[PDB]
Structures are given as structure tokens and as C-alpha cells.
RNA sequence: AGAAUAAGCACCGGCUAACUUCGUGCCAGCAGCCGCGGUAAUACGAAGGGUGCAAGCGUUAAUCGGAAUUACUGGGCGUAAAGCGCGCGUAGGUGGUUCAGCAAGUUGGAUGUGAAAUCCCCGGGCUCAACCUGGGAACUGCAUCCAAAACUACUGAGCU
RNA sequence: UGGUGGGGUAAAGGCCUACCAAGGCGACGAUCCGUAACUGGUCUGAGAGGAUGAUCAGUCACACUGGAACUGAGACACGG
């Protein structure tokens, strides 16, 4: 019920999108790879800007594809 | 249309009961909801007849599942 | 089952193969003294794989087995766990084709496995007419009450203390009826089979 | 030993002014049946005489396989030149499921439980070098480490 | 060739294209003879084989090999085929099987009656 | 450039190992330094020696055997790259259990046998062997 | 009632331990790799015998295998195929050194599952085997949860 | 691709709509192009895997071809 990501673009209101990284193994090779994830958060009054980290939670979809709300501003 | 209903497994002129609790909407012997205990009208030496446990079939009868015509003269075997 | 005349098949191997026809003797007409085929006055390279042939080639030859069904006899001593050459002949030996003459209720294992489908060796009061059921460790073994006066039944007797006891069974002469005691080990067998070595003609 | 192994025998040629003579080299290995391997062949012209010309080494560079008893010492990892070998023991009931070369070697050291490969080169030349090179540093106990395990 | 070159550019299996352009993973396939004719062997060799072409119902243009000692197959007939490349001969790689439709069967031909079509 | 600080020093002893030399030194680290203080339990090498001074460095005291040495290979599993972070039920028996396996884990830089007996895995870090 | 109603196929030059001749003569042909046939043919056509395993035996086709012959396990590159002619450096891969912190990767346990089938063992039954099921085992997986801090990332102060 | 006003679906939602803004996706392979139902599984394999989806069971999809609703609890309905 937590994911985090870096913020990457700010520049419309009440959305964001961010990048949720991982860094995961692939099967057949081993080496653990990092695999971005980039969701898009919805901003209840759009006070998030480029690079801040944010957590966030899964509720009814709030567009098309945005289905995650801003839970709360962790560091900048 | 929730059902408890004997449901043809085995071999032809081999018949093998599940007694599935199925939904009617599908098939005897595919997608049921539950199987509890078996039956076996073959049953010779060592095999038992139907292993029906009453701590599900309880369940199904709360929930409103019902015998079809045979299985309530399963039960009455008991 | 092998069938035909069977003078020709105790050449190639040199052992008796308790493969006969009367109560006297064997390889004693039939003139056994080259090595048949084609053109065999002449041997030469008897080595490996070809030797590891022909000891599977004689235990085919001995037990009425064919290769549909002695390489699935195989299949079981890996499904056995551990010692793989003796487990072969475990089966072997709780098959009915063989213990009927291991008693000794027919001539040889040519009249066992034929009486055993004509309704003669029951198991434990059923009707069996396969030879190759697995006798457990513990059963009876008599006849069906209608071949007791089949007199070729009693042309068997005779051999008992003359082909050698087996000791591992007890059995009731008068009735005509005997009991499978236990399964053997490797020593209760002819010392003319190399067990590890029909195990090695499997992957090549 | 007198567990004597035939591996191969293959028929070499060099040539003469006068034309082509043929001769055979034939390489065996000897064991005592308890792990005393050895190896050799013999440049002969003859078949029946290059294979005791082999004896003629074979007896001798004998080297005590340190065993276990039935059983290998460790999963191996050896080489020779351009060929790698793989072994690692088995446990009870399977017989001889090494190859070629390898089915020669490993059934006069007294294991039977072989499971050998050859890797790189299959030249049985430089076969019977990588089987020896993965016995000669077999050891359950002569490590220096100051401790039973 | 390292795991991170790998993961960028992972090593793909090489296929291995197929030994017949016609028989599309088919055990056999009917054909329509076009021409039987003569045809020599390769050079260390000398001979004189017949080998006929056919038209498929896959409507390809190769060669088969007419592997009988005799046959009436008489330029238009519909011959059946399976693969095997004849080594002797250049550049083909396919058999007429004997006793399909058309083809009659090799006289007498006493032992392996099931390779050259013969009944009994 | 250096990638890696302990496959440089187990690379560095394997060809002193073959070579006539006993004392090691190099530039070490504590990471250097508690790989060394387990196998010296082994009865592999002795005194790991860190000299307590600025740029401290590692004096490990390998032993001879007459003739070949006790270490015949090191050979390193888990390098940078494929870092080969591995369970408690697949701990790697490397010479029938005559290598002793050292796994890097929360509680201590381990053999295999106390890895598996306080199970934690991890790090596969070298063959002792 | 009575042996009356039942066997066939392919090969036999090699590395397959099934291995005389007769007809044919670089002809006719066979064959998977070598090859065989150019006049005593164990390689090709019969007969004459064996052998493979059997109401099936063979060969056409397709799949994986042996194939370390796409090598993560587990390969290569001076001359066999293979180092761009070399730089600056973007993403990225990996990153000297120390304490502290985080708990993303890593590690253990917990719980829901991972449907049933199939498979793997113990069985029960068909007179036996398939087949049939009962019991479990298995399902290396997935997220959640708490516990861990040697190492990696990240965070901060540094050390040369 | 967001934002709000409304409109609408049994139900969230540019799904539909007007207007406001210039965002969105993508070198971890977008878009286009060729190919194919998918999975439990199946087959060869020491395993890793590789190949693979006939009977069996779950989900999907279609009903001469295409568009479309209607009725009904449930369809954009194989013998409507």
C-alpha cells in the first residue's frame, strides 16, 4: 500500500507522474536489473515539483490512466 | 441454480462420482465450485463408498445450494 | 512366448536354458557342439556389447519374455531404489510363468505358461489365467479342480529332487497345491546371468 | 596391477621416399582394481605388440588414487590442453555412466559410480591426462588445515 | 558476450532452415510428373539413373528420384513422394515411394517388399 | 580503473601462492579485513595483521606446505557483476563440503556450515579451497 | 467339438561380433556416414540361412537430445571465424575509503494462495497391466506482515 | 494528455461533450511491420532449458461478411 517515485513532470495541474524504480533480477540471467515504473499521480492541490520523492495510494480510477492519489510528500 | 450434483468422472461402464457443488451455468464436469467427498457404485473390497464430509456440506445448504434429486438420498444414507 | 523347434536355441548360449522336451536329458540328440547362424564353423571377437547382448538375449530366450515387456521389467528397477541388477530378477521371479515350474507342476516353463491361461493355477481362490501376475510374499498357489487327472501333470513330479530342490518353498504333493514363501535374493538363482550387465545395454 | 584396459587403437602412417609405412600406436591403462592408475602406449609395426608395448609404460608411473571406497572424493574440475573434464559422485546403485576414455580410467581405481564428461577437445590422446590431473589431488583428510572437518 | 551485454543484446538460437522446400512438415505430397529422363552420376562414379520432375499440388518444380528397377510411370502420372537426398546424384532430394497410386511395383523384387512395392 | 577491493586481494595471494613469497601487503579495507579473520579459523593462513596507521593495510601470513601450498584456487562467485545473492537451502557444498564456503550475512561473514545451522544466506563470496 | 480358425516384417560392407555361394560385371543398382559395383561381389539383384521384436515391422516427415554447435549454468577473438583506426564522452553497467542511518535488492519465519486435472510416492480396483481414483507430496511462484543489518543502492558528515 | 461545467453507464473513467491550458508516449524498444488465442500444461532434457497449446479443465473470441440495437436479471443473441 506504499509506492515511491521521483517526480519527472510537474507542468500540468492536479496530475503528476513519477518514477517508481525497482531494481529486480532477470531469470534466465541473474544480473539484478533496475526496471522503471512511471505511474501518474493525481494531486489534490498540485504542490509537487521536479525531482521531489512522494509516496502514494490505489483508490477508483481518477482519469484514464491514473488510478493513484498523492498520499503525501515524504523529502524533496 | 447453486447445486450439489453427482458428476460423472471414471471410465466408460467405470462410473466415479465427485458430488461437485456446481452453479448449473456450466458444464458436469467442468468449473465447479467445491468438490466434497466422492462416490463410487462400484465399490468392491477396500473401497470406500463416499467419503462426504459434513463440515462443508453444511455450507452450501446454509448458503442455499440444494440436492438435485439423488444427492438427498445420498444423505439419507448416513 | 517363443515358439517352433528349440534344439537350434541351445547352441548359442552353451547352458542348459531349462528349455526341454522329455525327462532324460538335454542337448544330448540334438547335437550341440559348434555355434549356428548362418556360417559358424568359425568364432572370432567375442568382446562387449555384443556379449552384453547376448546375456540379455538369452534371459529373453529363458522367461517367455518379449522386449514390449522385459525393458518395461527395466523400467521398474530404476522405480526401485537401489540395487538395480538383482530388482530385475525380483520380478522374475513373483512372475507365474516361472514359479509354476519352480515348483514344478509342469514339464517346463513351455507347459507352465500354457496351463496357467488354459484355467489350471488359480491364486487365492480367484480365477487368473495371466502369466504375469505378481505372487505376493504370502499366498497360496493351487489348481483348478478339473486338471488334477491331466496325468501330464503328474509326468512334472519326477524332477523335483532331480532338477534340485529350490528351497523357498512349501508345498503339498497330495492336494497338488503349493505356497510361495518369500522373494529371493541373489543367491538363489543360476550363477550363469551377469545382473549389473544387462543394465549396461541401455544407453547404448 | 593386472586390470588391465584397452582405450584405442589407431593406425598411424608416415612415409618413405620408397613409399607409405604403416605403423600402429595403441594406448592402455593398467590399475590394481584399488587405484594404482597408468598410462602409455607403444610405437610398434604390429597390432598384438602395441598394446604390450603400451604395457611397457603402463606398469610403470603408477600412482595411488587416493579413494574413499566406492565412492569419489569431490565434484572435479580439470583440464589438459583442450580438453576439460567433469566429474562428481553418485550414490549407490548405478553403474558405469562415464564415456569412451572415461569408462577406462575410472573402473580400475575400484569406484563404479563414475558419472565423467569430456569437454573441449574428444581427442582420447589428451583424454586420459584430464581424468588423471582430476585424480591426482584427491584428498579427505591431507589438506594442512589444523582440523578433522 | 558478458551478462550486461546480455541483457542489452541477448545471443539468439540461429534457426536451421528445413533440407525439403517442399513437403511443409508433411510425411507425404501427391504430384503431377512433368518429364522422366536420364540423368548421369557424380564424376568418381559413372552409371545411367532416371529421375523424373514433377509438378506439386504445393505447384513447386522439383525432382524426385523413380527408385525401382522398372516402371510404367508414363509422363503424366501421380506419383507420391517422400524425402531422402540421393547422394550420387547432384542436386536433388526427393523419392517416388512404390505402390502408392500410379506406381506399379518392382518385378520380382523378393525381400524388402515394403521399400519397393510389393504385395504378399 | 580498480572495480573491485577483495577479488584484487584474492587474486594478489593465488600467484604469490606459486610464487616464493610469504608476507602479503596491500592497501586494505575492513570489508578486506573480515574475510581474513574467518579462514585464519580455518587453519588457512594466520595473523592478518592490520598495521593501525593511516592507509592501513593487510599483512596476511599465508602457510606453506612442503612443496604446494594449502590453497589451491580461490576462485570468486559473486565478482561486481552477477553478485549470485543465494538462499540457505542452495549453499554451494564446493569440494564435498572440504571448502567451507564463506557467505556474506546480517549476523556475520560465514562459513557454510554456520550458515546453514543459524540459517542465512546471501553473499556466496569465494571457494576457500 | 478338436490343435480344427492364427506370423509377419526388415535387414546381415561397418562402430553393431545377425555376416557361403548363385545371377549380374563402372552394367543393373543400393545407401543415413564411409562407400559398394570396373569378372572368386560378406556392400547390388535372388535363392540358402540367421538375427532384430513381434500383429506388427520398417522409412518418409516433424520435435528435443548428443550440440560447450549462441556456452546464465557453460565457449570464444596474435596467426583458424572474430579488436571499430583510434578518441571526447550521453543513457547505462559497475564503482577507493570510515562511522551512522534507511530497509529498495539481499536473509529467515508467518498467512492467503499457487484452481481441479496432469505428474511424483503410498495405495484401493478391473483375474493382471494400462486405466481408475483415495491420501499426500509437488507446484522453485506472488503480494502483504513482522524480525535482521555483513555487503549494494540511496541519505549525510568525512578519510587520501 | 490533464482541468472544470454539464451530459451519460447498473457502476469509476475524455467514455460522451463544450471551452481552458500544452501536455502525453518512447531507446527498460514507442509507433509501424510480420506472426499467434492464452494458461494450467505438454514433449525432449542431468537440470537449466528448448520446443510447444490435438483429447482434458479455466478464461478469451467468433457464428456467411460488416454495422446496429431490441427484448430480457443476464446478449449487442450460433438453430433472434
Known amino acids: 500500500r506504499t509506492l515511491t517515485g521521483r517526480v519527472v513532470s510537474d507542468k500540468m495541474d492536479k496530475t503528476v507522474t513519477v518514477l517508481i524504480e525497482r531494481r529486480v533480477k532477470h531469470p534466465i540471467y541473474g544480473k539484478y536489473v533496475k526496471r522503471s515504473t512511471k505511474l501518474h499521480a493525481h494531486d489534490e492541490s498540485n504542490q509537487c515539483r521536479i525531482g521531489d520523492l512522494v509516496t502514494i495510494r490505489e483508490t477508483r480510477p481518477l482519469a484514464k490512466t491514473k488510478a493513484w492519489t498523492l498520499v503525501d510528500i515524504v523529502e524533496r | 441454480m447453486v447445486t450439489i450434483r453427482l458428476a460423472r468422472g471414471g471410465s466408460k461402464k467405470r462410473p466415479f ?61 448416513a | 512366448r517363443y515358439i517352433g523347434p528349440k534344439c537350434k536355441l541351445s547352441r548359442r548360449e552353451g547352458t542348459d536354458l531349462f528349455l526341454k522336451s522329455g525327462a532324460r536329458a538335454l542337448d544330448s540328440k540334438c547335437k550341440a557342439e559348434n555355434v549356428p547362424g548362418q556360417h559358424g564353423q568359425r568364432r572370432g571377437r567375442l568382446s562387449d556389447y555384443g556379449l552384453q547382448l547376448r546375456e540379455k538375449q538369452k534371459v529373453r530366450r529363458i522367461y517367455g519374455v518379449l522386449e514390449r515387456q522385459f525393458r518395461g521389467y527395466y523400467q521398474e528397477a530404476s522405480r526401485r531404489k537401489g540395487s538395480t541388477g538383482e530388482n530385475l530378477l525380483q520380478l522374475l521371479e513373483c512372475r507365474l510363468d516361472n514359479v ?73 504333493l497330495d492336494k497338488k497345491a503349493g505356497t510361495f514363501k518369500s522373494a529371493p535374493a541373489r543367491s538363489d538363482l543360476s550363477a550363469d546371468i551377469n545382473e549389473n550387465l544387462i543394465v549396461e545395454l541401455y544407453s547404448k | 596391477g593386472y586390470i588391465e584396459k584397452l582405450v584405442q587403437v589407431n593406425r598411424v602412417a608416415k612415409t618413405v621416399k620408397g613409399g607409405r609405412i604403416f605403423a600402429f600406436t595403441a594406448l592402455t591403462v593398467v590399475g590394481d582394481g584399488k587405484g594404482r592408475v597408468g598410462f602409455g602406449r607403444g610405437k610398434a609395426r604390429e597390432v598384438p605388440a602395441a598394446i604390450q608395448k603400451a604395457m611397457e609404460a603402463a606398469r610403470r608411473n603408477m600412482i595411488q588414487v587416493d579413494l574413499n571406497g566406492t565412492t569419489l572424493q569431490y565434484p572435479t574440475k580439470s583440464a589438459h590442453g583442450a580438453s576439460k573434464v567433469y566429474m562428481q559422485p553418485a550414490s549407490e546403485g548405478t553403474g558405469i555412466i562415464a564415456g569412451g576414455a572415461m569408462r577406462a580410467v575410472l573402473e580400475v581405481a575400484g569406484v563404479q559410480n563414475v558419472l565423467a564428461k569430456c569437454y573441449g577437445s574428444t581427442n582420447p590422446v589428451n583424454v586420459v591426462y584430464a581424468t588423471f590431473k582430476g585424480l591426482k589431488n584427491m584428498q579427505p583428510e591431507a589438506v594442512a588445515a589444523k582440523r578433522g572437518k | 558476450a558478458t551478462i550486461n551485454q546480455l541483457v542489452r543484446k541477448p545471443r539468439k538460437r540461429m534457426v536451421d532452415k528445413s533440407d525439403v522446400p517442399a513437403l511443409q512438415n508433411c510425411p507425404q505430397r501427391r504430384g503431377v510428373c512433368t518429364r522422366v529422363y536420364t540423368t548421369t552420376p557424380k564424376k568418381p562414379n559413372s552409371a545411367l539413373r532416371k529421375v523424373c520432375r514433377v509438378r506439386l499440388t504445393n505447384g513447386f518444380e522439383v525432382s524426385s528420384y523413380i527408385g525401382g528397377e522398372g516402371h510404367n510411370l508414363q509422363e503424366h502420372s501421380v506419383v507420391l513422394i517422400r524425402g531422402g537426398r540421393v547422394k550420387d546424384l547432384p542436386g536433388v532430394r526427393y523419392h517416388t515411394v512404390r505402390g502408392s497410386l500410379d506406381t506399379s511395383g518392382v518385378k520380382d523384387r523378393k525381400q524388402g517388399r515394403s521399400k519397393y512395392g510389393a504385395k504378399r | 580503473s580498480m572495480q573491485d577491493p577483495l577479488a584484487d586481494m584474492l587474486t594478489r595471494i593465488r600467484n ?23 579462514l585464519k579459523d580455518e587453519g588457512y593462513i594466520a595473523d592478518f595483521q592490520i598495521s593501525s596507521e593511516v592507509k592501513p593495510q593487510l599483512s596476511i601470513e599465508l602457510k606453506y606446505f612442503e612443496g604446494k601450498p594449502v590453497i589451491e584456487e580461490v576462485k570468486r562467485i559473486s565478482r561486481p557483476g552477477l553478485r549470485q545473492y543465494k538462499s540457505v537451502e542452495q549453499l554451494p557444498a564446493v569440494r564435498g563440503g572440504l571448502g567451507v564456503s564463506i557467505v556474506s550475512t546480517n549476523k556475520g561473514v560465514m562459513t557454510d556450515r554456520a550458515a546453514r545451522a543459524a540459517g542465512v544466506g546471501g553473499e556466496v563470496l569465494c571457494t576457500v579451497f
Open chain 6, 16 to 38: 604469490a601462492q606459486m610464487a616464493e613469497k610469504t608476507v602479503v601487503s596491500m592497501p586494505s579495507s575492513k570489508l578486506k579485513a573480515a574475510v581474513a579473520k574467518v
Open chain 2, 17 to 77: 462420482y465427485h458430488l461437485t457443488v456446481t452453479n448449473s451455468r456450466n458444464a458436469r464436469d467442468g468449473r465447479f465450485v467445491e468438490r466434497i467427498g466422492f462416490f463410487n457404485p462400484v465399490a468392491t473390497g477396500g473401497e470406500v463408498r463416499l467419503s462426504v464430509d459434513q463440515e462443508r456440506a453444511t455450507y452450501w445448504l446454509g448458503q442455499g445450494a440444494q440436492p438435485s434429486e439423488r444427492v438427498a438420498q445420498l444423505l439419507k444414507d
Open chain 3, 100 to 172: 509354476v515350474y519352480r515348483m514344478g507342476f509342469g514339464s517346463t516353463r513351455s507347459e507352465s505358461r500354457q496351463l496357467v491361461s488354459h484355467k489350471a493355477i488359480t491364486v487365492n481362490g480367484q480365477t487368473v489365467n495371466i502369466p504375469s501376475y505378481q505372487v505376493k510374499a504370502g499366498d497360496v498357489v493351487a489348481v483348478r479342480e478339473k486338471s488334477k487327472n491331466q496325468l501330464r501333470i503328474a509326468q512334472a513330479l519326477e524332477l523335483c529332487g532331480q532338477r534340485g530342490r529350490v528351497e523357498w518353498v512349501e508345498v503339498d
